Amino acid sequence: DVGTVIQVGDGIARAHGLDNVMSGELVEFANGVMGMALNLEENNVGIVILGPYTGIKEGDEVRRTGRIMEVPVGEALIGRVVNPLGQPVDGLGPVETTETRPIESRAPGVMDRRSVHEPLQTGIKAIDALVPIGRGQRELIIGDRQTGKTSVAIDTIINQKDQNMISIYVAIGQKESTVRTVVETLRKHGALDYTIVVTASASQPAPLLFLAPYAGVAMGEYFMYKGKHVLVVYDDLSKQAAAYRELSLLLRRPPGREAYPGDIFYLHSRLLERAAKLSDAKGGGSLTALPFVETQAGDISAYIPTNVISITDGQIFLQSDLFFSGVRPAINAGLSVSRVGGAAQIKAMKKVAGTLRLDLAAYRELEAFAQFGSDLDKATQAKLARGARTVEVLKQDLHQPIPVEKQVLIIYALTRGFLDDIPVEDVRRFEKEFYLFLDQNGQHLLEHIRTTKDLPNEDDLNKAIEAFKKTFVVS
Amino acid sequence: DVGTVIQVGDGIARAHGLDNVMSGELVEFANGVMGMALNLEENNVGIVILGPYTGIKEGDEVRRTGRIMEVPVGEALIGRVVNPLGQPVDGLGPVETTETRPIESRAPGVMDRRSVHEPLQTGIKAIDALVPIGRGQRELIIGDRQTGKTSVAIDTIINQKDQNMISIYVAIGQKESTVRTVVETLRKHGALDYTIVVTASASQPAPLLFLAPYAGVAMGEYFMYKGKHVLVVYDDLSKQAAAYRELSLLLRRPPGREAYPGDIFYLHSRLLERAAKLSDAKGGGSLTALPFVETQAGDISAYIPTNVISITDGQIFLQSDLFFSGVRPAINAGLSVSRVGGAAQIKAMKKVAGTLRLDLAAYRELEAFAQFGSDLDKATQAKLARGARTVEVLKQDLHQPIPVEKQVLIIYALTRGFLDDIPVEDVRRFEKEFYLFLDQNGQHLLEHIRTTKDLPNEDDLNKAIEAFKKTFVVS
Amino acid sequence: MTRGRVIQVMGPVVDVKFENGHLPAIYNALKIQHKARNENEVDIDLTLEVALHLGDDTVRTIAMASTDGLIRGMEVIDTGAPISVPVGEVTLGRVFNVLGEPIDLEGDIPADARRDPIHRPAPKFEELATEVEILETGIKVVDLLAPYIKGGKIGLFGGAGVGKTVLIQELIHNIAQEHGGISVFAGVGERTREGNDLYHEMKDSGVISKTAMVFGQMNEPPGARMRVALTGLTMAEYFRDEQGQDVLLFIDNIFRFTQAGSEVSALLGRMPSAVGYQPTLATEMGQLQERITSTAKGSITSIQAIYVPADDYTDPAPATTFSHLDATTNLERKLAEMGIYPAVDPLASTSRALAPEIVGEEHYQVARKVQQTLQRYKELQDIIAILGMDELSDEDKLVVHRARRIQFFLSQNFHVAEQFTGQPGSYVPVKETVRGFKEILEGKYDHLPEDAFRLVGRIEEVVEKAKAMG
Known part of the structure; x- marks a missing residue:
């Protein structure tokens, strides 16, 4: 041969x-x-x-x-930085993997799967409260460049430190320097003992770019078939599509729409269909995918964006203008929908977010009208104050995920009008000092929420929040 | 060989x-x-x-x-259902035709033709009164799917039972079940003793689809060259264009606009140019074509629609929204024009339709304004009542063509304000009972109109209509 | 039989050469079965479909699964016939793939069971029916405002979560109960999660025993995603031809069938068409749908769910699909929020059957008279919002009074809803529907609370329920 x-x-x-x-x-x-x-x-x-x-x-x-094509897999790869092929990029010598898996493998059948019920805790108040995600789900995060997608991915991966999750980050066509910065940011927070990084930088040959997600999914599927939860992230699918287009054209493949080949739907479908929630017979493993797609000028209506939206079980739309205004992370209420949402959420989170949605939408429409008309009755004024406090509550500082219990506690405090006399600016400092008060006093509430996944008694919770309000000083 | x-x-x-x-x-x-x-x-x-x-x-x-390529022709084909080639589809054994004609034949020259003067009676009040057609003309009927085109074609073919016309119906790319339903509807009204049906269903190979109209036109031209009037109908030309595009692409023909070949104008022009009104030397035969074109979203501005409009001597535009409102058949006043119109119409029909057009247009524009402004003077109110009665008069029930004489009588009754005190709803029942009164009493008027093609004396006609008004009861 | 050897491989496309002078037909199926002799080789078992003859004793094929591992010189066997699917009562309650193998973990089909080829010519002109016949579903609004017809195509237009699956299972249950007609569900290019959810929803309703399911999902190669609809079609066709009963065929998405055909044409090397579609689109769509017809013995009525990704119907796929349609049922989420089920839009739903030559005079009269009041109420609601109802004319008040009750009367307590809420389930005939609507219009049941109408079957239950409530 x-x-x-x-x-x-x-x-x-x-x-x-x-x-x-x-x-x-x-x-x-x-x-x-x-x-x-x-x-x-x-x-x-x-x-x-x-x-x-x-x-x-x-x-x-x-x-x-x-x-x-055989990508090596195993626990030996945890903490390393690897090529799409089984070769290291971070130095530190060879990996000494246990076994290999072919990247092109059949997905599990229908009969083999199960409904998604256990949640994925991102640690981002807006995402957890309004757009919940479950393990085994596939949700698309779409937005313009420089909108915070990678910040959300890092915040999610870091929060997984408490849980039993395994995480994989696939950098596609990214700049090597920001990949190095992301890796060092992961180490700084100590998230490297349970993560794997596969990289294909913009300078690499086009063939390596489209092979990266298949190596990532093979590495993830190695663990899931043995009963482990896995979370794979793709920061740039559209660049994989572009690299495949390039490779096809160099083979003189006749084009289609734009000049993408017909395989565009086949490629992404064959990739994203391997995320599943395996049945009890298979072992109960779960693989969650979070693909990222970059769109031009913020318009979600395009070939690749709508093509991917046809596959995923939901999408989160990140707005650039709100990102520039200082709100982090920007999310569009109208276009963000999750179809598994409502099953994953714990009881208290559901009970409070149900009211939170109505308040936010009412404030949105009322503010959309207020810019033209300033004549408002008392009810609309109180509605506007509630909406302003609500939109201020959902703000989050970079790289500091919040545990679910404090989220449900603060949102409960918001819903029942405990901020009636607190001015808008004081609300944020109110949240921080409330977290301190919960840490020193409300330990039983936190432990009850952790063990039981249910809201504690209304009277004791109101007593604690009232005591903190008594301690708190305005301005 | x-x-x-x-x-x-x-x-x-x-x-x-x-x-x-x-x-x-x-x-x-x-x-x-x-x-x-x-x-x-x-x-x-x-x-x-x-x-x-x-x-x-x-x-x-x-x-x-x-x-x-030789399509068989002859009187033996009347009442049969045949392929584009000379083979039966309805069973009933072989046809035993007399002679054959090549489908690709030269059209008669200029010098060989004559102006169109003798009319074609469709039996549809709106079409006969406002958009007249003559024998040898080529008028295009264009509209959206499910707008009533085939209903108009059947109503026209049935009305030809009285005249000396020969009719041919060419089904192109249609569903076989609706073709069978149309054939059984033709038999139910007894129109099969003077018609021929050539069919090419959607499941047939693409080559047979574009060859169907040429077989139809060869069959029609067999009779016309011997001095007979012929009426050919094509329900779907655009599917013939699509089949020809397919066949060309399978031959690796480089495309044009859209990806239609350059032959698009050549195909339809070479087809539709064989309809003519032969001179007295040739024999005086006439061949009338009524091609149907289906447009998307009701927009008449497109490649194939405008391409065909460039050829035909006029067009009738059928609106989908009016079809859904219950008005049958829907016709757009603005876009429906016939250039031979006015020469074919008999004297009385012209004398009355001249006023009918003005009344309808005035009502159209006034109603287009009325939806915004309700302040109208007496004159505009009377104009609106006249317009409403006029638009109600033009309604027609399915598959019941009306003879021309009753049309001109009822439109004359409308124009001269014989419905001044009759409410809007009673107008339709007024028309039916007026038809009965004419049948029992006004036989002389009908026979005079038939023999002379002219309006009878105003005084006697008014006396008869007045007598019927005396008999008629409101509600 | 004759055995050929492979000469070329690229993607889903393989080329074979036959030396003995006998070559397969255009649609014949070929099979590759090789056991690895060494660690350098891979075990393969693949099924091929012929596409073209290319001379030099060579043929071209399209594969139904991944071609990895093929080697030149590998033998290919000719079966002598197209893809053969097992047909009969053995298919009920089981899930199959394109090749006719059972996906579900409930055993395998016995060897000697008869099998019929997928590819056959459409029925002829003589064998079709002659009169349009209404198909009674038992759903008040569907039978009243947009009737179905045997052998016709009904287009379902709605989003996820508006009640599509409830309506589908209700239709399957009603058709199996009264008319004695089985159903077939074919999944083409859908999410496997929705397939699992549909399977579990059918198992939790007792329907699975009365239906057969064939699945090809997004992950599948283009050829299987194309031919899955055809194998489902031949499964339903067996019941129509041999058993003589009426059949109902569900297709998950008509769009991706054309998309897969376009992909296969692009792979095969044909020149593209407008928007890069296959040149052979229309004849393929016709060949699929022209076998779905109502013959003398039986009929195959088909409900097709159509989803357009970009909400633009001017493209060739929506254009060709809409050309074959006979009726369209559109689902609206506003009525689902209102609480009306199955929340079909009364004003936006249409059918070509709503003509007196087909449905009769009284049906047409009552339908149009009801739609008049519905449109008037829809217009009048904004006037009611801007200006006080009390100031409005008595006629408008009467119109609103009738309209609200009529809109509530559209709802029906379905069978499948028996478990989520305790309800017997009502099946309503058309004539009593018409009589009830007419009597509501005239005022026989005028002096009743509007709350009673919210969820009722026939009209007498309305009076009984209202008297019970007050």
């Missing part, structure tokens, strides 16, 4: 011989670079190169490894 | 040999399916298959029939 290159250029090659090569195989060049064998012809083989091809010359010898 | 197939697929084939085949010939396969010989190459022949090609295999023998 030996062959010689007869053509090379743009990252593709043609080889003579190789009589026994299998479709989808990996081949090793004379210098040592690896490639796929995508197309087999009557008398030549087409090869796709997954690295620097500058050293490949006509007449060079190419040999086949004897195996389909 | 024998050859062997070397390639087959998608309904096209390539054959070796066939040294003496002529362009445009029909060839018979070994199993018995028929095909065209469109393209001749240096060493192979291209064949287009007009039926189920699943049985055609490489190495099969193909022979040529020795003739150009």
Whole structure:
């Protein structure tokens, strides 16, 4: 099984011989670079190169490894930074993995799955309260560039430190320097003992870019089949689509709409369908996917955005203008919907967020009218004050996730009008000092919420909040 | 003249040999399916298959029939249901036709024709009164799907029972079940003794779809050259265009606008130019065409619609919203124009429709204003009442064509304010009871209108209408 | 039989060469079965579908699953026929894939069971029916304002969470109960989560025994996503032809069938069309839907759920799909918030059957007279909002009074809702629906509380319930 290159250029090659090569195989060049064998012809083989091809010359010898694309997996990869292939990027020598899995594998069947019921705690008040997520779900986060998507991903991954989750972060087409900054930010908060990072920077060959999510999903599926919860994040799917378009065009594939090939829906569907909530017979493992899509000018109506929205079980829309105004993280009420939402939420969170939604929507529409008309009756004025306090409550500082129990406590304090006489600005400091008061006094409430997932007695909770209000000083 | 197939697929084939085949010939396969010989190459022949090609295999023998495409014609086809080729679809054994005509034939020259003067009676009050049609004319009926086009075609064909007309109905790409329903509806009213039905259902190969109108026009032209009036109807031209596009693309023809080939104007022009009003030397025969075009969202501005409008001598625009409101058939006053109109109409119909147009347009614009402003003077109020009565008069029940004389009588009754005190709802029942009163009493008026094509004396007509008004009871 | 050897592989496309002088037909199925001789090889078991003849004793095929591992010189066997699906009573209550294998963990179909090819010509002109016949579902508003017809296509237009599945299961239950007609559900290009939810919702309602399900989801290769509808169709066709009963066929999404066909055409090497669609779109859509017809022995009425991603109907797929439609039922979430079920829009729903030549005079009269009052109330509501009701004319007050009661009377206490709320379930005939609506209009049941009408079946229950309430 030996062959010689007869053509090379743009990252593709043609080889003579190789009589026994299998479709989808990996081949090793004379210098040592690896490639796929995508197309087999009557008398030549087409090869796709997954690295620097500058050293490949006509007449060079190419040999086949004897195996389909195999990404190594195992616990040995936790804390490392790896290529889409099984090679390290952070130094620290080799990984010494246990076993390998082919990236192109059949997804579990229908019969094999189960409904999503256990929640995923992001630690972001707005997301947890209004757009809940469950384990095994697939929710899309969509927005413009420089809107805070990666900040939300990091805040979510950090909050998983308490739970039993395993996390995987796949950087696609990102700048290497911000990837290094993100890795050092993860280490700074100590989240590296349960995470894996797979990277494919913008300077890499296009073939490596679309292969990254499949390596990520193979690594995640290794753990899930053994009964572990896994959370995979893709920061840039659209760049994977662009890299696949490039690779297809270099193969002279006739285009479609835009000039994307027909595989656009096939690619993303075959990728995102492997996130599931396995049945008790399989082992009960769960794999949650959080793909990110970047849209132009904030318009959600486009080929790739709507194509992905057709697949996912919901979406979160992040607005750029609100991001510039200082509100973090910006979320659009109208376009953010979750179809699994309401089943994952614990009882208290549901009981309070139900009122929270109505208050926020009423304030939104009333404010949308107020800019034109200033003549408002007492009821509308009280509604506006409530809405303003509500929108102030949902503010969150960077990289500081909040536990669910303090969220439900503060939102309960909001709903029942405990902030009637507290001015708007004092509300934030009210939240911090209330967290302190809960830490020193309300430990029983926190433990009850943790163990029981239910709201404590109204009278004792009101007594505690009243005591803190008695302590609190305005301005 | 024998050859062997070397390639087959998608309904096209390539054959070796066939040294003496002529362009445009029909060839018979070994199993018995028929095909065209469109393209001749240096060493192979291209064949287009007009039926189920699943049985055609490489190495099969193909022979040529020795003739150009010949559709059989004759009186033997009246009442039958036939393929685009000369083969029956209704059962009832073979047709036993007399002679055949090639579908691709030169149209009569200019010098050979004559102006259109004798009318075509549709039996639809609105069409006959406002958009008259003459024999030899070509008028396009355009509208959205589910707007009543086929109902208008059936109402027109049925009304031809009295006259000397021969009718042909060509179903293009239609559902077979609605074709069967239409045929049974034609038989129910006894219109099958003078009609011919050629069908090409949606499940048929694309080549048969574009060949259907040419078979229809050849069948119609057989009769016209012998001095008979013929009325051909095409329910769906746009599907013929789509089938031709498909066939061209399967031949790797480079596209144009949309991806229609350049032949789009050539196809429809070469088809519709054979409708004419032959001169006295040729024999005086006439062929009237009524092509139907389906447009999307009701917008008349598109490639195929405007392309066809460039050819026809006028168009009738059917509105979907009015069709849903219960008005049948819906017609748009603004976009419906006939350029031969005014020459075909008989004297009385012209004398009354002249006022009818003004009243309808005045009511249209006044009502378009009335929705915003309710302050109207006496004159505008009387104008609105007249317009409302006018729009109520033009209503027609399904599949019940009205003879011209009763049309002109009722419209005359309308114009002269014989409905001054009759309420709006009673107007329709007024029309029915007036038809009864004319049947029992006004026979002389009907016979005079039939023989003379002129309005009777005003005084006697007013006396008769006054007598009926004396008999009529309101509510 | 004849066995060929592979010569080319690329994506889902494979090419085979046959030496013995006999070559497969255009639609024949071929199978590859190879056991790995060494660790350098991989075990493969793949089914192929022929597409084209290319000369030099070679043929072209489209694969139904991933082609990884194929080698030149590998043998391919010809079955001699298209994809054969097992048909009969053995299919009820089981889930299949495209190839006719059971996905559900309840055993396998026996070897000797008869199997019929998926590809066959459509029924002919002579064999069709001659009169349009209404299909009685038993749902008040559906039968009143937008009747169904046997052999017709009904388009379902609604979003997730507006009650689609409740209506679907209610229709399956009613059709199985009265007319003795089974149903078939085919999933094409949908989320597997919704497939699991639908399966569990059917199992929790006792319907699964009366239906058969074929699933092809988003993850599947294009060829299976194309032919899943055809295998479901032949499963229903067996019941129509041999058993002579009426059948109801559900299709999850008509759009992705055309999308998969476009993908397969692009892979095959044909020149594109407008918006990059396949040139062969219309004939494929017709060949699928022209087998769904009402013959003498039986009929296959089909309910097709259509979802357009961009809400633009001018594209070739919505254009071609809408061309075959006969009726359209549109679901609105505003009435779901109001509490009316199944929340079909009375004003926006249409059917071509609502003509006196098909439904009769009284049905048309009552439908139009009801729709008049509904439109008047819809317009009058904003006037009621801006200006006080008391100042308005007596006629407008009467119109509102009748309209609210009529709008409430549209609702019906379904069968499947028996568990979430304790309800017997009502099945209403058309004639009593018409009589009840007419009597509501005339004023026989005028002097009753509007609360009574909220959830009732036939009209006498309204009086009994109102007397009980007060």
